[PDB]
Amino acid sequence: AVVASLKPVGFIASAIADGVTETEVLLPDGASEHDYSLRPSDVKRLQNADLVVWVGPEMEAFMQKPVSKLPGAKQVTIAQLEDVKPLLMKSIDFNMHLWLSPEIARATAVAIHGKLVELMPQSRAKLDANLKDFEAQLASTETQVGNELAPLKGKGYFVFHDAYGYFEKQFGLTPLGHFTVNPEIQPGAQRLHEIRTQLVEQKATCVFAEPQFRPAVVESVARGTSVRMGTLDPLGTNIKLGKTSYSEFLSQLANQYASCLKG
Numbered sequence: 256a257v258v259a260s261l262k263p264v265g266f267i268a269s270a271i272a273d274g275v276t277e278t279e280v281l282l283p284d285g286a287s288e289h290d291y292s293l294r295p296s297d298v299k300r301l302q303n304a305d306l307v308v309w310v311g312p313e314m315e316a317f318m319q320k321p322v323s324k325l326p327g328a329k330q331v332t333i334a335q336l337e338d339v340k341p342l343l344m345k346s347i348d349f350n351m352h353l354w355l356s357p358e359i360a361r362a363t364a365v366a367i368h369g370k371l372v373e374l375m376p377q378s379r380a381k382l383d384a385n386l387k388d389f390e391a392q393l394a395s396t397e398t399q400v401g402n403e404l405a406p407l408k409g410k411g412y413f414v415f416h417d418a419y420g421y422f423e424k425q426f427g428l429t430p431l432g433h434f435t436v437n438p439e440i441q442p443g444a445q446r447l448h449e450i451r452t453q454l455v456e457q458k459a460t461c462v463f464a465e466p467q468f469r470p471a472v473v474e475s476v477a478r479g480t481s482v483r484m485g486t487l488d489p490l491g492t493n494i495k496l497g498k499t500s501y502s503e504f505l506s507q508l509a510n511q512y513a514s515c516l517k518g
């Protein structure tokens with residue numbers, strides 16, 4: 256099996272490995288990439304994996320130590336791939352939400368493919384086909400997502416999690432910035448004043464919460480203002496692993512944006 260750190264990383268892995276081997280994801284649905292510790296049993300899961308795919312030490316802090324017990328030959332460490340490094344964005348220290356970049360997703364898929372071919376040369380033909388099928392899917396999706404978000408150019412929005420920079424830049428979306436907010440408690444008066452001022456001064460169209468946010472949080476932020484409330488899921492909790500899962504994840508995100516922004 257290929258073991259991926261986070262679910263969308265698993266979506267990319269499962270496209271290349273479909274019909275050759277299994278793909279498992281380490282981070283459970285609902286968990287945060289920034290606040291997690293691996294299970295006691297994951298140690299054996301990593302040792303048995305054919306391949307471990309992760310972003311890198313600036314993203315999955317929960318994997319630094321366990322990954323040092325693995326040869327670099329077993330790893331696809333996306334942030335440190337030669338073709339990924341020139342693609343890294345700041346951030347105004349790079350933004351490490353790489354699985355949201357169709358071009359880094361392609362570089363990731365090439366790396367996975369290269370390595371599975373070495374380990375399973377008998378499955379070369381299937382692996383080659385899976386890479387070709389992944390490219391075809393992703394290019395159709397890029398076209399669809401591009402068409403979807405183009406009429407939304409110029410509509411400014413804020414988000415509560417700075418995870419979307421690679422996606423936004425490729426598809427011409429107008430983010431205004433992000434806010435650092437507690438997902439669990441209602442914002443107090445100060446934080447509400449600072450946010451709502453920006454919402455009004457910058458004439459925001461939307462604020463986007465995330466699934467792990469209890470509804471009353473964003474509702475409190477939006478109260479009074481004419482700003483609409485949306486939801487984005489950067490980890491595609493909703494979507495099941497499989498051949499078409501990465502393309503599905505990107506389309507769902509574009510729909511989430513459009514569902515609030517169209518208007």
Ligand SMILES: [Co+2]
Nearest residue numbers: 288289417418
């Ligand atoms: Co994040």
